[PDB]
Design a protein around this ligand. Structure first.
Ligand SMILES: COc1ccc(C(=O)N2CCCC2=O)cc1
Ligand SMILES: N[C@@H](CCC(=O)O)C(=O)O
Ligand SMILES: N[C@@H](CCC(=O)O)C(=O)O
Ligand SMILES: [Zn+2]
Ligand SMILES: [Zn+2]
Ligand SMILES: [Zn+2]
Ligand SMILES: [Zn+2]
Lengths: 258, 258
């Protein structure tokens, strides 16, 4: 009767509460996806337990073993019933799991330390002084690997061979590298994460240029799961009631520091 | 073997070609949804015929007879196999038809004649000199009818009782009323239509303020249709290949006149 909700520690979607080490179960966490899971479970009338994905990854398929990792693998292998996380709806994932209609819009974007002389992907592509990278095992890395657009093909050729590695294990590690690199590293990440970090102390980063694509996050369920339909209607209802909007303002802008 | 694709004459999604009266069948039409239908049919490997919906409506359910009109009714009553049109994904529609993941993002927006002293919905709500309305039988009208947000509730109370009527039979009729009214009528319509008109001669309108909501258009199929799955993957593929982007630029901005 208690369903397992896989999710990932990524600010401001799921974060440890201030005193989390004194708390237990769902009470350990807060953020946009913690609130979304609560609202969804309320409408679908299920009890649930949040479970941070062990490997800390969104989900990709190993080309060798063909095994899915991350939250996607938790659904595929039957270890979680739903994922409520900033999980990008992509074709390769839709082949193996189901997604709700999207609860948030986003695009890939460029994060720079303020003052870096870069305004566009073209600007990064044509130079070599400023290194740049992306998160491992997620949809941004796959966007670059799969693109047939000249500028992004050039960026992928550079990142794939860069030494030392430009692929980070977590978003926070990429942000930290931008902040510590005196303008010499830029990070490619989703506009939602980029806009959140831009509003947080020390206010030394910014999003530059427009987004490189336009896509959405959805709530995911194992393929053919009976929960898929009610979850989808719940997301649509929350959207129409203005709740998704209220949550975005709560977690991004209400508390902005910059 | 030839499937019926319902659609609607709405610029720049489907428009008559210059010499349409000398042409037949699918060749009569051009625009973003004509291109999208072609790309989808190519991936799903179907032959198809475009059919402009007879009543010229998107789709709503009559509260009395309970009958669906517009493109939604064509799918519900079995007269069309797919709708490829700027058809908004909504909860009440998802209860009776299926939708692909969204091919375009949009929100409700305000269209004014340039120079009108209005910058926000709040600005319209608190005054009465400038009338304002929306399209009949679509999702924008339903947004206002259903909102529990104070400002939009006030706008709905005004529009519902306005005399003469502020609800238009087509988008073009609303645009024409804005243009002819010397600043005394504003039109509530989707950001996509608003941004297209803003780029067309006589360049006398503009979008003002941010969008009131955030939602998407999807390709629709009758509930439980076998075409639903392949169409959805086709839309995701076109999105990832940058084709939806290319089409948006082709139909909105490439030809901009303002
Ligand atoms: C919050 O509303 C939305 C979030 C995401 C999406 C989406 O998935 N897509 C696909 C193509 C372009 C785009 O934005 C559409 C609407
Ligand atoms: N949302 C992405 C993770 C972040 C990224 O790849 O930039 C995914 O679902 O894979
Ligand atoms: N896209 C809308 C029509 C336009 C509007 O209502 O503003 C619909 O699907 O109903
Ligand atoms: Zn701690
Ligand atoms: Zn609720
Ligand atoms: Zn004509
Ligand atoms: Zn194609």
């Amino acid at each position: 009767r208690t369903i397992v909700v896989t999710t990932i520690l990524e600010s401001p979607y799921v974060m440890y509460k201030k005193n989390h080490e004194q708390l237990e179960g769902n009470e350990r966490y807060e953020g946009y996806c913690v609130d979304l899971a609560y609202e969804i479970a309320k409408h679908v009338r299920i009890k649930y337990k949040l479970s941070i994905v062990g490997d800390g990854k969104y989900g990709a398929r190993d080309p060798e073993t063909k095994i899915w990792n991350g939250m996607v693998g938790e659904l595929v292998y039957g270890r979680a019933d739903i994922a409520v996380a900033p999980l990008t709806i992509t074709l390769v994932r839709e082949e193996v799991i189901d997604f709700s209609k999207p609860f948030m819009s986003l695009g890939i974007s460029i994060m720079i330390k303020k003052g870096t002389p870069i305004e566009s992907a073209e600007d990064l592509a044509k130079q070599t002084e400023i290194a740049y990278g992306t998160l491992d095992s997620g949809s941004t890395k796959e966007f670059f690997r799969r693109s047939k657009i000249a500028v992004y093909e050039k960026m992928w050729s550079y990142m794939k061979s860069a030494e030392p590695s430009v692929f980070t294990k977590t978003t926070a590690d990429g942000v930290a590298r931008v902040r510590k690199s005196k303008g010499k590293f830029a990070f490619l990440l989703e506009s939602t994460m980029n806009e959140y970090i831009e509003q947080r102390k020390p206010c030394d980063t910014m999003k530059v240029g427009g987004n490189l694509d336009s896509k959405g996050y959805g709530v995911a369920t194992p393929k053919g799961s009976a929960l898929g339909t009610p979850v989808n209607l719940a997301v649509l209802k929350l959207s129409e009631q203005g709740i998704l909007d209220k949550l975005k303002n709560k977690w991004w802008y209400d508390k902005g520091e910059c």
